[PDB]
Amino acid sequence: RFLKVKNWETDVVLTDTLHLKSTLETGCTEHICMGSIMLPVRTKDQLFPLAKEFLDQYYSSIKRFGSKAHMDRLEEVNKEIESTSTYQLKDTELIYGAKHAWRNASRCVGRIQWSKLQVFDARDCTTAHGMFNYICNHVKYATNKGNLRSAITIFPQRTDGKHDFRVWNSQLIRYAGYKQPDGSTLGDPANVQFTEICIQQGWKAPRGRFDVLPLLLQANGNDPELFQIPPELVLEVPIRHPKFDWFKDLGLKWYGLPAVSNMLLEIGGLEFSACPFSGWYMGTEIGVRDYCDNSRYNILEEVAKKMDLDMRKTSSLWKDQALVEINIAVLYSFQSDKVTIVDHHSATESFIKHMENEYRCRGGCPADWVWIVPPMSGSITPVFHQEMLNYRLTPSFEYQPDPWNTHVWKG
Amino acid sequence: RFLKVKNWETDVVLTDTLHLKSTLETGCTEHICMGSIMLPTKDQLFPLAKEFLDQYYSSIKRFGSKAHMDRLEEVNKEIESTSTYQLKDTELIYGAKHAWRNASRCVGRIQWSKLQVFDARDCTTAHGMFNYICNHVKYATNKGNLRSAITIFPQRTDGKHDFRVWNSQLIRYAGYKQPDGSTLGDPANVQFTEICIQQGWKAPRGRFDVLPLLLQANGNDPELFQIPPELVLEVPIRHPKFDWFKDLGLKWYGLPAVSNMLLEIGGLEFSACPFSGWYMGTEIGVRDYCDNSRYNILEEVAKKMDLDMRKTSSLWKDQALVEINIAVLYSFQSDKVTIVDHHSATESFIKHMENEYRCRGGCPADWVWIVPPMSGSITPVFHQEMLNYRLTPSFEYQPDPWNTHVW
Ligand code: HEM
Ligand code: HEM
Ligand SMILES: CN(C)c1ccc(CCNCc2ccc3ccc(N)nc3c2)cc1
Ligand SMILES: CN(C)c1ccc(CCNCc2ccc3ccc(N)nc3c2)cc1
């Protein structure tokens, strides 16, 4: 079956055959679309077909499908599964797998970069101190003094579900949030629960507006342990505006490295519950969501006051005016400090080219419009006008529950 | 089977039961979501009539009454006899209002119950249609104090006697392709404009030429009529800060009046059912003015603002976009023509959603369309999970008449 998608601005029509390779469910049915819903122990039974599907993919990609090396690998994996109930990926397969999980991430606008990903194999790691060391190295490598490089660090896979490696932080670098007795929040409201956990675990909070959170690291199903990332490895950018000199006085800064550390990487039926990865920021992540979300730093008003906008009526679009200048400031600040960042115009323009390339060479490109379209200036980006098909391919990154909700405490 | 939607900004959770009454299909499957795709007999008829009459009589607290059963058998008799049936005025009004209520792509639905329904089922000719349309236009425009309305022409019979308005909106600007290669006026309306011209329209070949109506009655060939200019309320666009803005020569019309959709009620099809409300500012400022395939004036405005258009990272497009939308809202408000900004409208819609979940068990909503085309995440709807499903009565798309018309 062939599915077509149209760009209504260019009239470019693309044909998707790749969706036929999709096995996982979407959440939607013929009777309901759940496109805007945020989030809608394994036996050898189901494991070998998942292994086999993956190895077929891997061997095709290297143009060795049906080769003796291919057949021997399947044989080897089958025996390892049936005798040990799981299996180990080769380094090559792991790298391929991690790149392809990124390639298949339908919510990622940055996928033009998918083939350039530094894979750090941390499957020999056994302790939290070991994890801390690997994470420091990842951060140093990825930061590269401002010339950001995409990377992922992969810790040992799940076994019985009782010995999971987990990074309890949602991102490797993130600011603390503190609920005040008066109901207000100091720092990042998104991180209040996690901050409370760290504090309970013994973290001494400075209690400021931009305190880099400690790492809370779980190796092999043991209770998680606290580590402070060397401050010298945490690159931060003071936010100023190229025209508004009062902007610096808002006291804003942000960190340079976005490094998501709470997702699950699935490759060939194997589950990597700790696989922190990092690229670089699109400006709106910080300027629109992090700064201007009502449930985050929420600085729109303070900014709009300082610009002396008419704030009596929303129809002045004071919020829209303030939002733009803030986003200008984020981009200006990162560029001036030579920290990698991309604006949403560049990023979405590159995504369209990527997506067209993928349709040609791959027969498709799963894309979640709801997430690909930037949170400001939507229709003046080309992706707004692009029809997209969302489906699930493996390897993939998946959500997993927060570890404090499932962890069995050892004491 | 009972579905929850969450608002991630306010933590409000609503439970949807209304989707279970859904009948039509979405285009999506368990294996693929098509949420971003723009367009994904007597025996057929009586269950449809029945489903509709059931909800009608339930809405007036007479479910399972004598009058309900009576109406049900009367319509039943009429279907067996005539192969169709006719809605009572009360049923027609209920159906039209609910078609709007059910329009998952409409952010303005808090107004759904305040709709003026004009019954034009007695209409037989294009001149008749013209008259009804002028009346609609005058009524809805109301000297700038806009009122929602729909005019309903006779229903489809055998598909050979369709009433159709060929225009996509009652009021729209012409588009002409130049020898210069570019496009004068509205590029969206190039094809329709040509059809007017080959049907006899004498175009002024200007930038903002109000198109003439092309009206088809009873499956006959369509005819041209000029809407009396005096009924077409237009707004010169100026900026409350930039004096040069007026020099751009921009204007827009006050009345958004969609005329090409199909209204389905109780299995009956109304192929000509133009309706109108009032504008949300971004439709004009963001889409009409800034879309590349529309009037595409961003560059010109940016230049007038003297912005650094060297690099995209200066966000000059975003700066210009905001000012354009400021001008639009400012101009309409200054001339006392009803308009709503995207902040006010989405905030209203959140309240409507909660009303509908509370009083009806749900509200079908298409996030891709409900989230405005600028400043998305600073409006509440961005953080609102929505379930999209198809309820009837409904407004549907239908093919452009010129591809279907046996001339
Ligand atoms: C290199 C530059 C990159 C850019 C500019 C970029 C951009 C983005 C953005 C803006 C989002 C939306 C995030 C949000 O709104 O929360 C996203 C999502 C995502 N990205 Fe990328 N990304 C990059 C690299 C990567 C890498 C290296 C990976 C993995 C190896 C990745 C995997 C993902 C995944 C799995 C999501 C979905 C997250 C979720 O569902 O919560 N991205 N990306
Ligand atoms: C009264 C003020 C109203 C406002 C502010 C409003 C707002 C909107 C907006 C912004 C859209 C998106 C349209 C687009 O982007 O092309 C829309 C779509 C729609 N509206 Fe409303 N509307 C109003 C009145 C009405 C009325 C009176 C009806 C019918 C009786 C209606 C039925 C629809 C339908 C069926 C759609 C989907 C159009 C499509 O699928 O192409 N609206 N509305
Ligand atoms: C629970 N809530 C409110 C919630 C949780 C996660 C999300 C999405 C987090 N996605 C973050 C994410 C993931 C991968 C990325 C890759 C690159 C980049 N620049 N940013 C990236 C950002 C949204 C809401
Ligand atoms: C096929 N293409 C290019 C295409 C067709 C229809 C559309 C959407 C047309 N619907 C416009 C529309 C419909 C109903 C409305 C009701 C009120 C209002 N203010 N605007 C309204 C605007 C977009 C693109």
Ligand SMILES: C[C@H](O)[C@H](O)[C@H]1CNc2nc(N)[nH]c(=O)c2N1
């Ligand atoms: C409810 C809605 O799905 C939710 O707010 C989504 C919308 N689109 C998004 N898009 C991106 N990139 N990131 C997000 O967090 C969200 N949030």
Ligand SMILES: C[C@H](O)[C@H](O)[C@H]1CNc2nc(N)[nH]c(=O)c2N1
């Ligand atoms: C491809 C995509 O579905 C298309 O551009 C949609 C996106 N959202 C929209 N939303 C509204 N309100 N109106 C539109 O025309 C569109 N266009």
Ligand SMILES: [Zn+2]
């Ligand atoms: Zn869907």
